[PDB]
């Protein structure tokens, strides 16, 4: 199909986020590339407003599931690529257990040959010395499954999943995710059977980078359907 063919090679990625969390306003710019043939993402993010007022790991899911590797036998379930190049809206509520929430609205689409993720993020109800505003989360990331289901009235999909962020005391900060995606364009899009994305993510630092930043290497494979 038209959309899937845009992802057979390495595709440059740009990410741009504006955020307001409890009145802390910030912006992040990211660059990198994706190779959906291998489910592979490499991205580097820079906070362009100074210090990021929330922990970098809490923004990983917000900062391009069109780069998931869908096995050939699951091609008919890949909503994300099918919406391209016109793109999709991706909205979430991320609920941090016993703390605040993020609401995110993003548009993921091509600008020329570059895949762009533009996000507006709003966070409210955070505790001043909770794990988020108190910066008590470890700089690392666990592997998780993203459970996808069709959302036919929206011509799209929804997803649910639980992210667990390690806390510096050894505990875990749960971030429940609810997600809805809607296509922007008028091409046919794929409405999938239930399945999941199996994600692993590794966070690192650029030793030469003095701005506040995050390097992400991520691998994602679609799964849960045998034929
Ligand atoms: Mg292929
Ligand atoms: Mg069927």
mmCIF file with all atom_site columns, C-alpha atoms and ligand atoms in Angstrom:
data_model
loop_
_atom_site.group_PDB
_atom_site.id
_atom_site.type_symbol
_atom_site.label_atom_id
_atom_site.label_alt_id
_atom_site.label_comp_id
_atom_site.label_asym_id
_atom_site.label_entity_id
_atom_site.label_seq_id
_atom_site.pdbx_PDB_ins_code
_atom_site.Cartn_x
_atom_site.Cartn_y
_atom_site.Cartn_z
_atom_site.occupancy
_atom_site.B_iso_or_equiv
_atom_site.pdbx_formal_charge
_atom_site.auth_seq_id
_atom_site.auth_comp_id
_atom_site.auth_asym_id
_atom_site.auth_atom_id
_atom_site.pdbx_PDB_model_num
ATOM   1   C  CA  . UNK A 1 1   ? 0.000   0.000   0.000  1.00 0.00 ? 1   UNK A CA  1
ATOM   2   C  CA  . UNK A 1 2   ? 0.925   3.654   -0.375 1.00 0.00 ? 2   UNK A CA  1
ATOM   3   C  CA  . UNK A 1 3   ? 1.684   4.256   3.297  1.00 0.00 ? 3   UNK A CA  1
ATOM   4   C  CA  . UNK A 1 4   ? 3.727   1.157   4.109  1.00 0.00 ? 4   UNK A CA  1
ATOM   5   C  CA  . UNK A 1 5   ? 6.040   1.752   1.139  1.00 0.00 ? 5   UNK A CA  1
ATOM   6   C  CA  . UNK A 1 6   ? 7.194   5.027   2.697  1.00 0.00 ? 6   UNK A CA  1
ATOM   7   C  CA  . UNK A 1 7   ? 8.900   3.050   5.486  1.00 0.00 ? 7   UNK A CA  1
ATOM   8   C  CA  . UNK A 1 8   ? 10.980  0.413   3.673  1.00 0.00 ? 8   UNK A CA  1
ATOM   9   C  CA  . UNK A 1 9   ? 14.167  2.431   4.205  1.00 0.00 ? 9   UNK A CA  1
ATOM   10  C  CA  . UNK A 1 10  ? 15.661  4.739   6.822  1.00 0.00 ? 10  UNK A CA  1
ATOM   11  C  CA  . UNK A 1 11  ? 13.406  7.755   7.397  1.00 0.00 ? 11  UNK A CA  1
ATOM   12  C  CA  . UNK A 1 12  ? 14.551  10.990  9.114  1.00 0.00 ? 12  UNK A CA  1
ATOM   13  C  CA  . UNK A 1 13  ? 12.475  11.979  12.143 1.00 0.00 ? 13  UNK A CA  1
ATOM   14  C  CA  . UNK A 1 14  ? 11.809  15.326  13.791 1.00 0.00 ? 14  UNK A CA  1
ATOM   15  C  CA  . UNK A 1 15  ? 10.032  15.757  17.125 1.00 0.00 ? 15  UNK A CA  1
ATOM   16  C  CA  . UNK A 1 16  ? 8.813   19.111  18.450 1.00 0.00 ? 16  UNK A CA  1
ATOM   17  C  CA  . UNK A 1 17  ? 7.015   19.469  21.778 1.00 0.00 ? 17  UNK A CA  1
ATOM   18  C  CA  . UNK A 1 18  ? 5.653   22.425  23.695 1.00 0.00 ? 18  UNK A CA  1
ATOM   19  C  CA  . UNK A 1 19  ? 4.685   21.674  27.275 1.00 0.00 ? 19  UNK A CA  1
ATOM   20  C  CA  . UNK A 1 20  ? 3.142   23.242  30.350 1.00 0.00 ? 20  UNK A CA  1
ATOM   21  C  CA  . UNK A 1 21  ? 3.280   21.099  33.515 1.00 0.00 ? 21  UNK A CA  1
ATOM   22  C  CA  . UNK A 1 22  ? 1.875   22.862  36.597 1.00 0.00 ? 22  UNK A CA  1
ATOM   23  C  CA  . UNK A 1 23  ? 2.723   26.195  34.934 1.00 0.00 ? 23  UNK A CA  1
ATOM   24  C  CA  . UNK A 1 24  ? 6.296   25.180  34.063 1.00 0.00 ? 24  UNK A CA  1
ATOM   25  C  CA  . UNK A 1 25  ? 6.483   25.978  30.355 1.00 0.00 ? 25  UNK A CA  1
ATOM   26  C  CA  . UNK A 1 26  ? 9.094   24.229  28.244 1.00 0.00 ? 26  UNK A CA  1
ATOM   27  C  CA  . UNK A 1 27  ? 9.953   23.088  24.744 1.00 0.00 ? 27  UNK A CA  1
ATOM   28  C  CA  . UNK A 1 28  ? 11.876  20.122  23.349 1.00 0.00 ? 28  UNK A CA  1
ATOM   29  C  CA  . UNK A 1 29  ? 13.289  19.509  19.873 1.00 0.00 ? 29  UNK A CA  1
ATOM   30  C  CA  . UNK A 1 30  ? 14.346  16.051  18.731 1.00 0.00 ? 30  UNK A CA  1
ATOM   31  C  CA  . UNK A 1 31  ? 16.019  14.559  15.680 1.00 0.00 ? 31  UNK A CA  1
ATOM   32  C  CA  . UNK A 1 32  ? 16.932  11.097  14.540 1.00 0.00 ? 32  UNK A CA  1
ATOM   33  C  CA  . UNK A 1 33  ? 15.818  8.363   12.226 1.00 0.00 ? 33  UNK A CA  1
ATOM   34  C  CA  . UNK A 1 34  ? 13.676  5.266   12.037 1.00 0.00 ? 34  UNK A CA  1
ATOM   35  C  CA  . UNK A 1 35  ? 14.065  1.965   10.208 1.00 0.00 ? 35  UNK A CA  1
ATOM   36  C  CA  . UNK A 1 36  ? 10.707  0.168   10.484 1.00 0.00 ? 36  UNK A CA  1
ATOM   37  C  CA  . UNK A 1 37  ? 12.158  -2.857  8.670  1.00 0.00 ? 37  UNK A CA  1
ATOM   38  C  CA  . UNK A 1 38  ? 13.914  -3.552  11.988 1.00 0.00 ? 38  UNK A CA  1
ATOM   39  C  CA  . UNK A 1 39  ? 11.426  -1.790  14.273 1.00 0.00 ? 39  UNK A CA  1
ATOM   40  C  CA  . UNK A 1 40  ? 14.263  0.563   15.097 1.00 0.00 ? 40  UNK A CA  1
ATOM   41  C  CA  . UNK A 1 41  ? 14.335  4.168   16.345 1.00 0.00 ? 41  UNK A CA  1
ATOM   42  C  CA  . UNK A 1 42  ? 17.231  6.439   17.298 1.00 0.00 ? 42  UNK A CA  1
ATOM   43  C  CA  . UNK A 1 43  ? 16.375  9.910   18.625 1.00 0.00 ? 43  UNK A CA  1
ATOM   44  C  CA  . UNK A 1 44  ? 18.142  12.713  20.480 1.00 0.00 ? 44  UNK A CA  1
ATOM   45  C  CA  . UNK A 1 45  ? 16.053  15.314  22.312 1.00 0.00 ? 45  UNK A CA  1
ATOM   46  C  CA  . UNK A 1 46  ? 17.176  18.716  23.579 1.00 0.00 ? 46  UNK A CA  1
ATOM   47  C  CA  . UNK A 1 47  ? 15.268  20.929  26.002 1.00 0.00 ? 47  UNK A CA  1
ATOM   48  C  CA  . UNK A 1 48  ? 15.513  24.299  24.250 1.00 0.00 ? 48  UNK A CA  1
ATOM   49  C  CA  . UNK A 1 49  ? 14.093  26.335  27.120 1.00 0.00 ? 49  UNK A CA  1
ATOM   50  C  CA  . UNK A 1 50  ? 16.724  25.367  29.713 1.00 0.00 ? 50  UNK A CA  1
ATOM   51  C  CA  . UNK A 1 51  ? 16.309  22.581  32.240 1.00 0.00 ? 51  UNK A CA  1
ATOM   52  C  CA  . UNK A 1 52  ? 13.463  20.153  31.595 1.00 0.00 ? 52  UNK A CA  1
ATOM   53  C  CA  . UNK A 1 53  ? 11.027  20.609  34.537 1.00 0.00 ? 53  UNK A CA  1
ATOM   54  C  CA  . UNK A 1 54  ? 9.925   16.940  34.505 1.00 0.00 ? 54  UNK A CA  1
ATOM   55  C  CA  . UNK A 1 55  ? 12.064  13.784  34.266 1.00 0.00 ? 55  UNK A CA  1
ATOM   56  C  CA  . UNK A 1 56  ? 13.069  12.836  30.731 1.00 0.00 ? 56  UNK A CA  1
ATOM   57  C  CA  . UNK A 1 57  ? 11.688  9.275   31.062 1.00 0.00 ? 57  UNK A CA  1
ATOM   58  C  CA  . UNK A 1 58  ? 8.172   10.616  31.601 1.00 0.00 ? 58  UNK A CA  1
ATOM   59  C  CA  . UNK A 1 59  ? 8.190   12.037  28.027 1.00 0.00 ? 59  UNK A CA  1
ATOM   60  C  CA  . UNK A 1 60  ? 9.503   8.965   26.153 1.00 0.00 ? 60  UNK A CA  1
ATOM   61  C  CA  . UNK A 1 61  ? 6.098   7.670   25.089 1.00 0.00 ? 61  UNK A CA  1
ATOM   62  C  CA  . UNK A 1 62  ? 4.981   11.154  24.006 1.00 0.00 ? 62  UNK A CA  1
ATOM   63  C  CA  . UNK A 1 63  ? 8.096   11.804  21.870 1.00 0.00 ? 63  UNK A CA  1
ATOM   64  C  CA  . UNK A 1 64  ? 6.115   7.568   16.175 1.00 0.00 ? 64  UNK A CA  1
ATOM   65  C  CA  . UNK A 1 65  ? 4.587   4.103   16.163 1.00 0.00 ? 65  UNK A CA  1
ATOM   66  C  CA  . UNK A 1 66  ? 4.674   4.054   12.372 1.00 0.00 ? 66  UNK A CA  1
ATOM   67  C  CA  . UNK A 1 67  ? 8.239   2.792   12.963 1.00 0.00 ? 67  UNK A CA  1
ATOM   68  C  CA  . UNK A 1 68  ? 7.023   -0.417  14.594 1.00 0.00 ? 68  UNK A CA  1
ATOM   69  C  CA  . UNK A 1 69  ? 8.007   -3.597  12.782 1.00 0.00 ? 69  UNK A CA  1
ATOM   70  C  CA  . UNK A 1 70  ? 4.792   -5.244  11.647 1.00 0.00 ? 70  UNK A CA  1
ATOM   71  C  CA  . UNK A 1 71  ? 5.565   -8.826  10.569 1.00 0.00 ? 71  UNK A CA  1
ATOM   72  C  CA  . UNK A 1 72  ? 4.560   -9.437  6.980  1.00 0.00 ? 72  UNK A CA  1
ATOM   73  C  CA  . UNK A 1 73  ? 1.635   -11.610 8.091  1.00 0.00 ? 73  UNK A CA  1
ATOM   74  C  CA  . UNK A 1 74  ? 0.367   -8.691  10.229 1.00 0.00 ? 74  UNK A CA  1
ATOM   75  C  CA  . UNK A 1 75  ? 0.680   -5.998  7.523  1.00 0.00 ? 75  UNK A CA  1
ATOM   76  C  CA  . UNK A 1 76  ? -3.082  -5.588  7.286  1.00 0.00 ? 76  UNK A CA  1
ATOM   77  C  CA  . UNK A 1 77  ? -3.148  -4.454  10.942 1.00 0.00 ? 77  UNK A CA  1
ATOM   78  C  CA  . UNK A 1 78  ? -0.694  -1.536  10.647 1.00 0.00 ? 78  UNK A CA  1
ATOM   79  C  CA  . UNK A 1 79  ? -2.900  1.522   11.075 1.00 0.00 ? 79  UNK A CA  1
ATOM   80  C  CA  . UNK A 1 80  ? 0.044   3.830   11.667 1.00 0.00 ? 80  UNK A CA  1
ATOM   81  C  CA  . UNK A 1 81  ? 1.737   3.482   8.295  1.00 0.00 ? 81  UNK A CA  1
ATOM   82  C  CA  . UNK A 1 82  ? -1.569  3.255   6.463  1.00 0.00 ? 82  UNK A CA  1
ATOM   83  C  CA  . UNK A 1 83  ? -2.420  6.834   7.521  1.00 0.00 ? 83  UNK A CA  1
ATOM   84  C  CA  . UNK A 1 84  ? 0.750   8.169   5.865  1.00 0.00 ? 84  UNK A CA  1
ATOM   85  C  CA  . UNK A 1 85  ? 1.776   10.495  4.373  1.00 0.00 ? 85  UNK A CA  1
ATOM   86  C  CA  . UNK A 1 86  ? -1.147  12.664  5.510  1.00 0.00 ? 86  UNK A CA  1
ATOM   87  C  CA  . UNK A 1 87  ? -0.684  11.362  9.042  1.00 0.00 ? 87  UNK A CA  1
ATOM   88  C  CA  . UNK A 1 88  ? -2.665  10.907  12.211 1.00 0.00 ? 88  UNK A CA  1
ATOM   89  C  CA  . UNK A 1 89  ? -3.625  12.705  15.389 1.00 0.00 ? 89  UNK A CA  1
ATOM   90  C  CA  . UNK A 1 90  ? -2.407  10.878  18.494 1.00 0.00 ? 90  UNK A CA  1
ATOM   91  C  CA  . UNK A 1 91  ? -3.959  11.870  21.809 1.00 0.00 ? 91  UNK A CA  1
ATOM   92  C  CA  . UNK A 1 92  ? -3.229  10.488  25.259 1.00 0.00 ? 92  UNK A CA  1
ATOM   93  C  CA  . UNK A 1 93  ? -4.005  10.828  28.910 1.00 0.00 ? 93  UNK A CA  1
ATOM   94  C  CA  . UNK A 1 94  ? -1.042  9.664   30.986 1.00 0.00 ? 94  UNK A CA  1
ATOM   95  C  CA  . UNK A 1 95  ? -2.105  9.230   34.629 1.00 0.00 ? 95  UNK A CA  1
ATOM   96  C  CA  . UNK A 1 96  ? 0.765   9.105   37.115 1.00 0.00 ? 96  UNK A CA  1
ATOM   97  C  CA  . UNK A 1 97  ? -0.484  7.044   40.051 1.00 0.00 ? 97  UNK A CA  1
ATOM   98  C  CA  . UNK A 1 98  ? -0.933  9.194   43.176 1.00 0.00 ? 98  UNK A CA  1
ATOM   99  C  CA  . UNK A 1 99  ? 0.252   12.241  41.211 1.00 0.00 ? 99  UNK A CA  1
ATOM   100 C  CA  . UNK A 1 100 ? -0.708  14.382  38.222 1.00 0.00 ? 100 UNK A CA  1
ATOM   101 C  CA  . UNK A 1 101 ? -1.582  13.667  34.615 1.00 0.00 ? 101 UNK A CA  1
ATOM   102 C  CA  . UNK A 1 102 ? -0.379  14.624  31.165 1.00 0.00 ? 102 UNK A CA  1
ATOM   103 C  CA  . UNK A 1 103 ? -2.776  15.220  28.315 1.00 0.00 ? 103 UNK A CA  1
ATOM   104 C  CA  . UNK A 1 104 ? -1.035  15.169  24.968 1.00 0.00 ? 104 UNK A CA  1
ATOM   105 C  CA  . UNK A 1 105 ? -2.212  15.985  21.471 1.00 0.00 ? 105 UNK A CA  1
ATOM   106 C  CA  . UNK A 1 106 ? 0.197   15.233  18.653 1.00 0.00 ? 106 UNK A CA  1
ATOM   107 C  CA  . UNK A 1 107 ? 0.141   15.154  14.882 1.00 0.00 ? 107 UNK A CA  1
ATOM   108 C  CA  . UNK A 1 108 ? 2.427   12.662  13.149 1.00 0.00 ? 108 UNK A CA  1
ATOM   109 C  CA  . UNK A 1 109 ? 2.847   13.165  9.414  1.00 0.00 ? 109 UNK A CA  1
ATOM   110 C  CA  . UNK A 1 110 ? 5.401   13.608  6.654  1.00 0.00 ? 110 UNK A CA  1
ATOM   111 C  CA  . UNK A 1 111 ? 6.885   16.990  5.788  1.00 0.00 ? 111 UNK A CA  1
ATOM   112 C  CA  . UNK A 1 112 ? 8.603   16.147  2.542  1.00 0.00 ? 112 UNK A CA  1
ATOM   113 C  CA  . UNK A 1 113 ? 10.501  12.945  3.241  1.00 0.00 ? 113 UNK A CA  1
ATOM   114 C  CA  . UNK A 1 114 ? 10.777  13.615  6.977  1.00 0.00 ? 114 UNK A CA  1
ATOM   115 C  CA  . UNK A 1 115 ? 8.451   12.043  9.524  1.00 0.00 ? 115 UNK A CA  1
ATOM   116 C  CA  . UNK A 1 116 ? 7.411   14.722  12.019 1.00 0.00 ? 116 UNK A CA  1
ATOM   117 C  CA  . UNK A 1 117 ? 5.805   14.402  15.461 1.00 0.00 ? 117 UNK A CA  1
ATOM   118 C  CA  . UNK A 1 118 ? 4.446   17.768  16.706 1.00 0.00 ? 118 UNK A CA  1
ATOM   119 C  CA  . UNK A 1 119 ? 3.092   17.632  20.272 1.00 0.00 ? 119 UNK A CA  1
ATOM   120 C  CA  . UNK A 1 120 ? 1.257   19.883  22.703 1.00 0.00 ? 120 UNK A CA  1
ATOM   121 C  CA  . UNK A 1 121 ? 1.488   18.593  26.277 1.00 0.00 ? 121 UNK A CA  1
ATOM   122 C  CA  . UNK A 1 122 ? -0.452  19.830  29.317 1.00 0.00 ? 122 UNK A CA  1
ATOM   123 C  CA  . UNK A 1 123 ? 0.255   18.507  32.790 1.00 0.00 ? 123 UNK A CA  1
ATOM   124 C  CA  . UNK A 1 124 ? -1.832  19.313  35.858 1.00 0.00 ? 124 UNK A CA  1
ATOM   125 C  CA  . UNK A 1 125 ? -2.322  18.159  39.443 1.00 0.00 ? 125 UNK A CA  1
ATOM   126 C  CA  . UNK A 1 126 ? 1.324   17.293  40.036 1.00 0.00 ? 126 UNK A CA  1
ATOM   127 C  CA  . UNK A 1 127 ? 2.682   17.251  43.566 1.00 0.00 ? 127 UNK A CA  1
ATOM   128 C  CA  . UNK A 1 128 ? 5.486   19.741  44.130 1.00 0.00 ? 128 UNK A CA  1
ATOM   129 C  CA  . UNK A 1 129 ? 7.730   17.063  45.630 1.00 0.00 ? 129 UNK A CA  1
ATOM   130 C  CA  . UNK A 1 130 ? 6.226   14.010  43.999 1.00 0.00 ? 130 UNK A CA  1
ATOM   131 C  CA  . UNK A 1 131 ? 8.296   11.764  41.798 1.00 0.00 ? 131 UNK A CA  1
ATOM   132 C  CA  . UNK A 1 132 ? 7.783   13.952  38.718 1.00 0.00 ? 132 UNK A CA  1
ATOM   133 C  CA  . UNK A 1 133 ? 8.301   17.535  39.890 1.00 0.00 ? 133 UNK A CA  1
ATOM   134 C  CA  . UNK A 1 134 ? 10.710  16.276  42.540 1.00 0.00 ? 134 UNK A CA  1
ATOM   135 C  CA  . UNK A 1 135 ? 12.855  14.515  39.897 1.00 0.00 ? 135 UNK A CA  1
ATOM   136 C  CA  . UNK A 1 136 ? 12.918  11.200  41.733 1.00 0.00 ? 136 UNK A CA  1
ATOM   137 C  CA  . UNK A 1 137 ? 12.824  8.935   38.664 1.00 0.00 ? 137 UNK A CA  1
ATOM   138 C  CA  . UNK A 1 138 ? 15.821  6.930   37.511 1.00 0.00 ? 138 UNK A CA  1
ATOM   139 C  CA  . UNK A 1 139 ? 17.235  7.708   34.077 1.00 0.00 ? 139 UNK A CA  1
ATOM   140 C  CA  . UNK A 1 140 ? 16.317  4.389   32.475 1.00 0.00 ? 140 UNK A CA  1
ATOM   141 C  CA  . UNK A 1 141 ? 13.364  2.646   30.870 1.00 0.00 ? 141 UNK A CA  1
ATOM   142 C  CA  . UNK A 1 142 ? 11.571  -0.688  31.110 1.00 0.00 ? 142 UNK A CA  1
ATOM   143 C  CA  . UNK A 1 143 ? 10.136  -2.807  28.297 1.00 0.00 ? 143 UNK A CA  1
ATOM   144 C  CA  . UNK A 1 144 ? 6.367   -2.734  27.839 1.00 0.00 ? 144 UNK A CA  1
ATOM   145 C  CA  . UNK A 1 145 ? 3.510   -3.972  25.661 1.00 0.00 ? 145 UNK A CA  1
ATOM   146 C  CA  . UNK A 1 146 ? 1.132   -1.496  23.984 1.00 0.00 ? 146 UNK A CA  1
ATOM   147 C  CA  . UNK A 1 147 ? -2.330  -3.059  23.546 1.00 0.00 ? 147 UNK A CA  1
ATOM   148 C  CA  . UNK A 1 148 ? -4.063  -1.825  20.371 1.00 0.00 ? 148 UNK A CA  1
ATOM   149 C  CA  . UNK A 1 149 ? -7.714  -2.114  19.380 1.00 0.00 ? 149 UNK A CA  1
ATOM   150 C  CA  . UNK A 1 150 ? -9.716  -0.644  16.518 1.00 0.00 ? 150 UNK A CA  1
ATOM   151 C  CA  . UNK A 1 151 ? -11.771 2.564   16.965 1.00 0.00 ? 151 UNK A CA  1
ATOM   152 C  CA  . UNK A 1 152 ? -14.077 2.326   13.959 1.00 0.00 ? 152 UNK A CA  1
ATOM   153 C  CA  . UNK A 1 153 ? -16.225 5.419   14.550 1.00 0.00 ? 153 UNK A CA  1
ATOM   154 C  CA  . UNK A 1 154 ? -13.058 7.525   14.567 1.00 0.00 ? 154 UNK A CA  1
ATOM   155 C  CA  . UNK A 1 155 ? -11.647 5.606   11.566 1.00 0.00 ? 155 UNK A CA  1
ATOM   156 C  CA  . UNK A 1 156 ? -8.683  4.875   13.850 1.00 0.00 ? 156 UNK A CA  1
ATOM   157 C  CA  . UNK A 1 157 ? -7.329  2.980   16.846 1.00 0.00 ? 157 UNK A CA  1
ATOM   158 C  CA  . UNK A 1 158 ? -7.075  3.178   20.591 1.00 0.00 ? 158 UNK A CA  1
ATOM   159 C  CA  . UNK A 1 159 ? -4.513  1.758   22.956 1.00 0.00 ? 159 UNK A CA  1
ATOM   160 C  CA  . UNK A 1 160 ? -4.039  1.075   26.641 1.00 0.00 ? 160 UNK A CA  1
ATOM   161 C  CA  . UNK A 1 161 ? -0.869  0.238   28.506 1.00 0.00 ? 161 UNK A CA  1
ATOM   162 C  CA  . UNK A 1 162 ? 0.943   0.679   31.790 1.00 0.00 ? 162 UNK A CA  1
ATOM   163 C  CA  . UNK A 1 163 ? 4.366   2.283   31.873 1.00 0.00 ? 163 UNK A CA  1
ATOM   164 C  CA  . UNK A 1 164 ? 6.420   1.704   35.001 1.00 0.00 ? 164 UNK A CA  1
ATOM   165 C  CA  . UNK A 1 165 ? 9.098   4.274   35.775 1.00 0.00 ? 165 UNK A CA  1
ATOM   166 C  CA  . UNK A 1 166 ? 11.737  3.164   38.259 1.00 0.00 ? 166 UNK A CA  1
ATOM   167 C  CA  . UNK A 1 167 ? 12.004  5.481   41.283 1.00 0.00 ? 167 UNK A CA  1
ATOM   168 C  CA  . UNK A 1 168 ? 15.429  6.220   42.795 1.00 0.00 ? 168 UNK A CA  1
ATOM   169 C  CA  . UNK A 1 169 ? 14.414  4.409   46.013 1.00 0.00 ? 169 UNK A CA  1
ATOM   170 C  CA  . UNK A 1 170 ? 13.873  1.181   44.083 1.00 0.00 ? 170 UNK A CA  1
ATOM   171 C  CA  . UNK A 1 171 ? 10.092  1.571   43.890 1.00 0.00 ? 171 UNK A CA  1
ATOM   172 C  CA  . UNK A 1 172 ? 8.032   2.181   40.736 1.00 0.00 ? 172 UNK A CA  1
ATOM   173 C  CA  . UNK A 1 173 ? 5.914   5.094   39.536 1.00 0.00 ? 173 UNK A CA  1
ATOM   174 C  CA  . UNK A 1 174 ? 3.054   3.791   37.406 1.00 0.00 ? 174 UNK A CA  1
ATOM   175 C  CA  . UNK A 1 175 ? 1.979   5.895   34.419 1.00 0.00 ? 175 UNK A CA  1
ATOM   176 C  CA  . UNK A 1 176 ? -1.283  4.546   33.012 1.00 0.00 ? 176 UNK A CA  1
ATOM   177 C  CA  . UNK A 1 177 ? -1.644  5.357   29.313 1.00 0.00 ? 177 UNK A CA  1
ATOM   178 C  CA  . UNK A 1 178 ? -4.863  5.744   27.353 1.00 0.00 ? 178 UNK A CA  1
ATOM   179 C  CA  . UNK A 1 179 ? -4.412  6.588   23.695 1.00 0.00 ? 179 UNK A CA  1
ATOM   180 C  CA  . UNK A 1 180 ? -6.567  7.447   20.662 1.00 0.00 ? 180 UNK A CA  1
ATOM   181 C  CA  . UNK A 1 181 ? -5.380  7.888   17.075 1.00 0.00 ? 181 UNK A CA  1
ATOM   182 C  CA  . UNK A 1 182 ? -7.397  9.401   14.205 1.00 0.00 ? 182 UNK A CA  1
ATOM   183 C  CA  . UNK A 1 183 ? -6.244  9.749   10.573 1.00 0.00 ? 183 UNK A CA  1
ATOM   184 C  CA  . UNK A 1 184 ? -5.804  13.239  9.154  1.00 0.00 ? 184 UNK A CA  1
ATOM   185 C  CA  . UNK A 1 185 ? -6.098  12.437  5.447  1.00 0.00 ? 185 UNK A CA  1
ATOM   186 C  CA  . UNK A 1 186 ? -8.694  10.868  3.187  1.00 0.00 ? 186 UNK A CA  1
ATOM   187 C  CA  . UNK A 1 187 ? -6.888  7.728   2.078  1.00 0.00 ? 187 UNK A CA  1
ATOM   188 C  CA  . UNK A 1 188 ? -8.020  4.322   3.235  1.00 0.00 ? 188 UNK A CA  1
ATOM   189 C  CA  . UNK A 1 189 ? -6.602  3.330   6.596  1.00 0.00 ? 189 UNK A CA  1
ATOM   190 C  CA  . UNK A 1 190 ? -6.264  -0.085  8.184  1.00 0.00 ? 190 UNK A CA  1
ATOM   191 C  CA  . UNK A 1 191 ? -8.516  -0.923  11.109 1.00 0.00 ? 191 UNK A CA  1
ATOM   192 C  CA  . UNK A 1 192 ? -6.644  -3.667  12.981 1.00 0.00 ? 192 UNK A CA  1
ATOM   193 C  CA  . UNK A 1 193 ? -7.578  -6.752  14.874 1.00 0.00 ? 193 UNK A CA  1
ATOM   194 C  CA  . UNK A 1 194 ? -6.474  -6.651  18.506 1.00 0.00 ? 194 UNK A CA  1
ATOM   195 C  CA  . UNK A 1 195 ? -2.722  -6.952  18.852 1.00 0.00 ? 195 UNK A CA  1
ATOM   196 C  CA  . UNK A 1 196 ? 0.125   -5.384  20.766 1.00 0.00 ? 196 UNK A CA  1
ATOM   197 C  CA  . UNK A 1 197 ? 3.446   -3.666  20.235 1.00 0.00 ? 197 UNK A CA  1
ATOM   198 C  CA  . UNK A 1 198 ? 6.381   -5.132  22.164 1.00 0.00 ? 198 UNK A CA  1
ATOM   199 C  CA  . UNK A 1 199 ? 8.685   -2.225  23.027 1.00 0.00 ? 199 UNK A CA  1
ATOM   200 C  CA  . UNK A 1 200 ? 12.145  -1.965  24.501 1.00 0.00 ? 200 UNK A CA  1
ATOM   201 C  CA  . UNK A 1 201 ? 13.773  1.413   25.098 1.00 0.00 ? 201 UNK A CA  1
ATOM   202 C  CA  . UNK A 1 202 ? 17.256  2.426   26.210 1.00 0.00 ? 202 UNK A CA  1
ATOM   203 C  CA  . UNK A 1 203 ? 18.115  5.920   27.453 1.00 0.00 ? 203 UNK A CA  1
ATOM   204 C  CA  . UNK A 1 204 ? 21.598  7.398   27.342 1.00 0.00 ? 204 UNK A CA  1
ATOM   205 C  CA  . UNK A 1 205 ? 23.496  10.680  27.405 1.00 0.00 ? 205 UNK A CA  1
ATOM   206 C  CA  . UNK A 1 206 ? 25.708  12.255  24.776 1.00 0.00 ? 206 UNK A CA  1
ATOM   207 C  CA  . UNK A 1 207 ? 28.946  12.813  26.742 1.00 0.00 ? 207 UNK A CA  1
ATOM   208 C  CA  . UNK A 1 208 ? 29.683  15.951  24.709 1.00 0.00 ? 208 UNK A CA  1
ATOM   209 C  CA  . UNK A 1 209 ? 26.220  17.496  25.158 1.00 0.00 ? 209 UNK A CA  1
ATOM   210 C  CA  . UNK A 1 210 ? 25.892  20.071  27.932 1.00 0.00 ? 210 UNK A CA  1
ATOM   211 C  CA  . UNK A 1 211 ? 22.294  21.051  27.192 1.00 0.00 ? 211 UNK A CA  1
ATOM   212 C  CA  . UNK A 1 212 ? 19.636  19.075  29.013 1.00 0.00 ? 212 UNK A CA  1
ATOM   213 C  CA  . UNK A 1 213 ? 18.936  16.171  26.676 1.00 0.00 ? 213 UNK A CA  1
ATOM   214 C  CA  . UNK A 1 214 ? 18.015  12.526  26.179 1.00 0.00 ? 214 UNK A CA  1
ATOM   215 C  CA  . UNK A 1 215 ? 19.235  9.922   23.685 1.00 0.00 ? 215 UNK A CA  1
ATOM   216 C  CA  . UNK A 1 216 ? 16.728  7.136   23.002 1.00 0.00 ? 216 UNK A CA  1
ATOM   217 C  CA  . UNK A 1 217 ? 17.266  3.830   21.186 1.00 0.00 ? 217 UNK A CA  1
ATOM   218 C  CA  . UNK A 1 218 ? 14.044  1.871   20.814 1.00 0.00 ? 218 UNK A CA  1
ATOM   219 C  CA  . UNK A 1 219 ? 12.970  -1.375  19.159 1.00 0.00 ? 219 UNK A CA  1
ATOM   220 C  CA  . UNK A 1 220 ? 9.322   -2.264  18.568 1.00 0.00 ? 220 UNK A CA  1
ATOM   221 C  CA  . UNK A 1 221 ? 7.757   -5.393  17.090 1.00 0.00 ? 221 UNK A CA  1
ATOM   222 C  CA  . UNK A 1 222 ? 4.042   -5.921  16.557 1.00 0.00 ? 222 UNK A CA  1
ATOM   223 C  CA  . UNK A 1 223 ? 2.838   -9.231  17.963 1.00 0.00 ? 223 UNK A CA  1
ATOM   224 C  CA  . UNK A 1 224 ? -0.143  -11.147 19.277 1.00 0.00 ? 224 UNK A CA  1
ATOM   225 C  CA  . UNK A 1 225 ? -1.468  -12.407 15.927 1.00 0.00 ? 225 UNK A CA  1
ATOM   226 C  CA  . UNK A 1 226 ? -0.256  -15.743 14.576 1.00 0.00 ? 226 UNK A CA  1
ATOM   227 C  CA  . UNK A 1 227 ? -1.609  -15.662 10.995 1.00 0.00 ? 227 UNK A CA  1
HETATM 228 MG MG1 . LIG B 2 .   ? 9.473   -5.057  4.694  1.00 0.00 ? 1   LIG B MG1 1
HETATM 229 MG MG1 . LIG B 2 .   ? -11.098 -11.448 11.133 1.00 0.00 ? 2   LIG B MG1 1
#
